């Protein structure tokens, strides 16, 4: 009938694909403020659950620009695959080697742009039998129309569309595993929730 | 072949998941006015057809805050499961125990937020063979994008996307079962329909 | 494999469901000017191809109000089923009686509201094996969210989502079948196309 | 399982359907500036990868108007099928004859309007076993609602929804195949990317 | 130099103009739920400060329909001027007599539609030297464009554009005048504020 | 002090400026359906109050195209000034001669595009001491941004921003002058008001 | 004659009015992410130019909640006026005393909500001859409509409408006064500008 | 007391302020495609009427980036003022010297961003008695809210808000001055108008 394949913190890896200084100016389907916070939220979550994290860039020594400094600072030890040519990250042998080295079946992916640098390796990974979870609000593209088309194409392939908050909650399962630690993530990336915490504290 | 598995007032139960004072401030994909009306509309419908109703909250003794007073006031005998830790309500044994105690195969679900507190138990219930009917306009989340992603994930699982008005009409089937009572629900939650009623009365 | 099941002018019937004066004030996902034009466009198309047309209303002697005068004036010989109680038109035996009396397998349907008076008989007709074509822009509801949920529910059942222009074009197949007649329909319901015709005529 | 059926520059043909001067005034779901740029972007891409290109128009000696001069100028040797009557291009034998003469199984299609001149031959081609790739941002129609319905109908048939940028990247595979040539396309149709290039050049 | 002409609860009167069941179906620049709540909010405020209130309708014995029952129920002794013909309420001598009988210099006005039934008497009252305060969110019309044009016309005439919340706060001046009474109004018409109250109460 | 300079049916003239078949394809800040209805509504009002009407076009024997047939058909005896070159209609001596020949102090103006063919003669007429009333929803332009700028420029000049409905009501003053005649206009151009009339008639 | 009265870093004071945990949940005309960034942006600017800063709250010991911790952390020596009752901060004698103690004629103001806690003291300050500069994107309210009404009221009174970025640039005047220092503010609150900086640095 | 001060091609100069590769990535209130077309349209117009043109940049040897090559290409003899520090271009003595050297009192201004690099010299120039005409659609900024605040501030100072099309038409006055030359500009920057020309040409 149906199988609920939900995120497991022991079976998941996170992929940050081409969050580069140049490419980010192409993102117009999210505001710069929301998009920065959403990506950093996913990064905090990846760091909080000690998930194997993989960083990759496309043509970073050109107009595409360098990876945002936050990602390198937060994951200084993570596999960093600079792709000089391959647009689909899965066409890069070093990238795929790094993914399989994690030993994780679940791939949490976010990047720029959604319709290409996210969609292409998502479709490729799905073909190889990976369970792919797309962080839709940490992935950006030219406009809502292009985004919706990318969703349709990935949905049809069996990708699970989610967001950083749902990713965090599905990984955490139970508040009591770490109340303050998890609460700090929510408070740090949901200003309305930070307000609830502060009011509750008085 | 396709089977129109529609709501039966003798086979349906209603689940209100985490409509709490704090969490409601996170809902931005509906205006506070429309969302309040939609939730209360579903509640009136649940009470009107005497459907087994289950109330549940998440970490209500924290920033998430208490359940809205209207729900506790309207359903004083309904099972009330306060979940101290489990984010997915289906991971709470008392919640599932209460759901199965109703003996209903059809689950009408609404809550906050859509992508988590609604989506997770929906996927879990669908996995167990339940027919899940999602009240999309009585469920709120951070923004339309997160909402649309939640829809995609629930749709792929076989969840039926509906709304409080369609839920009521599918339950009621025939106007003549109770013209005044059902009309009062419509008039009380559709101001435009209330206007039609008043004009017709003159 | 996929089969292009397209509209045939010898096998299609049109269903106008509850386009009533009162209920139309509930429609907010289309502007009153656009919605009136779209419905009348579908009507002109139904009449142009001499398609079997069925008119039905819900509780017309109440706040729901009478059928819009245009539909009755254009189809004075069409079966007119006033449903006193059944919300789903397919639960009315006389309505179903009229549909099957046409001998048409393809059902072109439009009405108010989309999530109920269109969705419910669409799902019912799909269950009995009918090919149902929904005229999405001649069907109205409370808001875009409710509409999108209704689309999702009908889509999963196998309904084909279309619009009055595509319905007309799929029925007509070839311009040369009636250049003057078909062009008059397009010009009469697409002001931009009327402008092209006038400019071309000088 | 799932198969990533991606565009191959050796197995793909591009179809420009009815981008005519008159019909373009019907397109309102894209701004005239963006739509012009998107169509021309797709054209540059088709020429860059030397893809078999087919131009077709509908009733061009009438109000529909002539094909835009750019398409005829850029593809002077491409098959040009002026369709006298058939609205669905696949109902035109000369058009289908030209498509099959390319020997390409992958069809990249764009045109006006989306719900008819794109949707109909897309569904027809899918029926014959072609892999159809729809350039959603190079296809225009009356409004977003009509667009979404067309997407739903084509998605249900197995069409792959894409955009000119993703189409180009999936065709190109690797930057190093032609850095200057491919970069010139991006800069020429993404003003933001042109800005990245100029800043990088200083 | 500038003079802050702010609302004074001893020098202000409230005018409810043509909030009738029929005319309300014309209001599309606000949703039915938000508009009802806003109008009732202004009514609660008017009653709370015991402000001289005037009710008026236009051609109520026709399609325009009766005044909403809430307004008559809340102000049973307030002057009720049924205007059989005059569109501008200020052209009705009984209406003007009632306005001046209050002896108030400040006129708080709301109604349907904004561009006519609000704008016209606003401009007329400003001409006679009244200080007119427009409750913009308790006044509805066909669309945002019509709204903005009406604002511009009233702005140029010297009308002060406000909303029910700002009207309430400017009248109240100080919380300590009546904390419970005023808080009940806010909580009863701001679902977000009611939630703050409930969380604070636990 | 402020003076309410309202429309008088004995002191007003209507100016239709460049509502031509070609130029109308430039109008994108209104949908083709609503814009057609609004212009025809203004036309009906001008004819209903027997107001001196002036029709003018710009370079009609070129791409701009002919005046829409409805306007000439409704006003066959009205002054028709085809402007060969002058973009500002007020720079055309025949146009100004016709305006002053009406002997009317109040100028009701609508046209295409708003920022030019409406704005320029509006400012010119305001300079000559005319009272100018702009029908904003019967005037179209490229986009909302351009429209708002045109509003700002005309507002600063002392132009009164209105719409066809408010224009009609300010001219009519009292329903009882002609209930049936005026009601027919409203019903004929407000699809929702037509519905109110039909329900009231039952 | 017009005088450009622009911000002077030696003659300006900054007012933060009621940016409280509870009241912030009422702000819906900005996303929580952009709004938090904008307020913190203004705070960094106030600190960067060492401007006299004044913090004030309204009924902080109730549902309104405490001031956001960032403001208190950044301005430990700033005047902190807790207003127990007065809604208009200018009706509070300690607040006005603190404002006049700065000796600054130019008031940069931001707060929650715009139509009340910002508008009221703005109008009051303008009455006392102060030059008031409104930071529109660091001020929040219920919805865009209420915001625009507040703008109209403050504009008509002579307030200068601005935003944190324009405020900063007008204070800074010249880049060379502190290139690195000012650039850090821009980079820290404009993610798009931070990207330009990083790309430029490689 | 109103004087229509319209653009004169013998008394006007054009100012392009900081249209730089870096700063353009900050513009989000216009799409990259529309904004590029709008700026280039203004440039073509400036060149067409041989208007004195002044180019200026802000900190171009930094993240702000170089001036777009098109402006530099079209005006190789125009005064080029690179401002190393002054944010307000009017604070640069070389810029003001160049403006006054043209001998033009009417200033046509466009740039990035609207609220700063356009607003500041606009306000300064108005102070010195210049007539300033703002090309609103050739000026970009962070978002519509920031845009509108800038409009309000410039409007209050007496700036005339326009757009490139209206600017061109007000300069051209009469079509017959140069039919083909002016028509080529319109056709080259209005795709909908280009379509009219092509259809008319057949
Ligand atoms: C916490 C967030 O909602 C606001 C914090 C800013 C205003 O300092
Ligand atoms: C929308 C309509 O029900 C308004 C109701 C009054 C009470 O505000
Ligand atoms: C009680 C109200 O403020 C919250 C809205 C709930 C009823 O959905
Ligand atoms: C065909 C239509 O766009 C013209 C009729 C209206 C503009 O008067
Ligand atoms: C008469 C009008 O208000 C209804 C619109 C269409 C459905 O007839
Ligand atoms: C710098 C900003 O544009 C993006 C930074 C986030 C994506 O880590
Ligand atoms: C490059 C693009 O973003 C705008 C600049 C034009 C004017 O060249
Ligand atoms: C819109 C037209 O004028 C330009 C041609 C584009 C569609 O290639
Ligand atoms: Cl590579
Ligand atoms: Cl639990
Ligand atoms: Cl029945
Ligand atoms: Cl053919
Ligand atoms: Cl009267
Ligand atoms: Cl002329
Ligand atoms: Cl106080
Ligand atoms: Cl300088």
Author numbering:
A (entry chain F), B (entry chain E), C (entry chain H), D (entry chain G), E (entry chain A), F (entry chain B), ...: 2 to 203
Copy text from the publication.
YcaC belongs to the isochorismatase-like protein family, which is a group of cysteine hydrolases known to work on vinyl ethers, conjugated primary amides and lactams. The crystal structure of the monomer consists of a central six-strand parallel beta-sheet with alpha-helices on both sides and three C-terminal helices that interact with the neighboring monomer. The quaternary structure is an octameric cylinder, which is built from two stacked tetramers. The pin-wheel arrangement of YcaC appears to be vital to the function of the more closely-related enzymes, since each putative active site is made up of residues from one chain and the C-terminus of the neighboring chain.
P. aeruginosa YcaC crystallized in two space groups with identical crystal morphology and similar resolution limits. In the crystal form II structure, the active site Cys118 is covalently modified to form an S-mercaptocysteine, while in the crystal form I structure, Cys118 is linked to a propanamide. Most likely, the reducing agent used in the crystallization, tris(2-carboxyethylphosphine) (TCEP), acted as a catalyst for the phosphine-catalyzed addition of excess acrylamide from the preparative native gel electrophoresis to the nucleophilic thiol of Cys118. The propanamide has a hydrogen bond to Ser59 at a distance of 3.0–3.1 Å, which supports the idea that acylamide is an accidental suicide substrate for a nucleophilic thiol. We have ascertained that the putative catalytic residue is indeed nucleophilic and reacts with electrophiles. Crystal form I also has one 2,5-hexanediol bound per sub-unit in the interface between subunits. The ligand density is poorly defined, and most of the interaction appears to be hydrophobic, but there are hydrogen bonds to residues Pro192, Asn196 or Glu71 of the neighboring chain. While the active site interaction between neighboring subunits is contained within the pin-wheel tetramer, the hexanediol binding bridges the dimerization of tetramers. Furthermore, one sulfate ion per monomer is located at a salt bridging distance from the stacked guardinium head groups of Arg7 and Arg174.
